[PDB]
């Protein structure tokens, strides 16, 4: 029920302020909050965020949800609390980590991930599938970028929130993420309605490029104008290595339409297979008929022909 909801937004919320004091003020969060400082979250971001600390005692969430009169077991049916099938007794589902809120669209904390910071397993724990918080449906960060989103009529899709939290601060705005899941139709549909373009920056690194071509490619199917910023490494570790605006500018710099991504990356086995050759030519010529931007997909067609050693006329023509 709507109120049911309501009360499992309260106790996120409520035990938010909480982790929030153990991380800042508590001798056993002092660790947690260390490992923070070390990795350049500064005493603002983790205020701005709302970062806590989770302690390890298996019954700190459980005591406080009982304390202000929760139903424990709503209480685990948010997903704050997990049940031991055997004892069938409640304790905290996190436990000595460092608690990131996630929020709705709306800006309602409705679930936490749980980062390690002692090289646990799994290394982020977030809550599970509830009523208030749906994977498939909420996109990090998006509330507190929706404004720039509408209005630069872009959204930037990191891997995770992590990635999200760096880049934010930096100076990029208009960026979210899914939670460790692939995008759903959903969360496009809520996209489509924001803005019609969407550039896609995820990890440097081959896994991360098949999920930049795999999603790249379902969004442009959607009717989507896509782009696509390739770093040299992640945002992290650009920001750090050149600075904020390095990282920004960077960004700005080099973005490109989808297709050109997709055909760059095919180059060298395009160029040293002819049966590979022809079936992309065809992926390529199929690609470029997808885009709704005449003024892009004509770009794209002078961008890609030279990768298949064909005229922009021949490649038009082919589509």
């Known amino acids: 029920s709507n109120a049911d909801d309501l009360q499992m937004i309260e106790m996120h919320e409520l035990i938010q302020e909480f982790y929030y004091y153990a991380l800042t003020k508590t001798v056993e969060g002092e660790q ?3 490992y923070l400082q070390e990795r350049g979250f500064t005493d603002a971001l983790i205020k701005e965020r709302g970062i806590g600390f989770a302690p390890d005692s298996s019954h700190f969430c459980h005591d406080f949800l009982q304390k ?8 685990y049916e948010a997903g704050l609390l997990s049940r031991n099938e055997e004892n069938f007794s409640y304790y905290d589902r996190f436990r000595n980590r460092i608690m990131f809120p996630l929020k709705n669209a709306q800006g309602r904390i409705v679930g936490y991930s749980g980062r390690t910071y002692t090289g646990q397993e799994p290394k982020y724990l977030n809550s599970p599938e509830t009523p208030i918080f749906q994977k498939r449906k909420l996109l990090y960060n998006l509330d507190k970028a929706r404004k720039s989103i509408r209005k630069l009529d872009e959204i930037v899709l990191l891997e995770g929130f992590m990635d999200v939290i760096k880049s934010d601060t930096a100076g990029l705005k208009n960026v979210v993420a899914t939670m460790g899941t692939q995008l759903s139709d959903e969360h496009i549909t809520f ?5 019609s373009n969407i550039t896609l920056m995820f990890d440097g690194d081959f896994a991360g490029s098949e ?9 442009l199917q959607q009717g989507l104008n896509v782009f ?7 945002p992290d570790e650009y920001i750090g290595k050149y600075g904020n605006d390095a990282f ?10 989808f297709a050109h991504y997709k055909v760059s990356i095919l180059k060298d086995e395009i160029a040293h297979n002819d049966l590979s050759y022809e079936r992309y030519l065809k992926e390529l ?13 004509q770009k ?4 890609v022909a030279p990768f298949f050693n064909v005229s922009p006329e021949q490649l038009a023509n082919e589509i």
């Open 248 to 257: 920004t500018t960077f960004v700005k710099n080099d973005k490109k339409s």
């Open 211 to 219: 999920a930049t071509l795999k999603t790249g490619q379902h969004l």
């Open 285 to 297: 010529s199929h690609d470029i008929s997808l885009m709704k931007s005449s003024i892009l997909q």
């Open 228 to 234: 696509v910023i390739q770093l040299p490494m992640d």
């Open 68 to 75: 202000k009169g929760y139903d424990i077991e709503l209480a």
């Open 191 to 195: 996209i489509r309605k924001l803005t």
């Open 300 to 303: 794209a067609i002078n961008d």
């Open 32 to 34: 947690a909050l260390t």
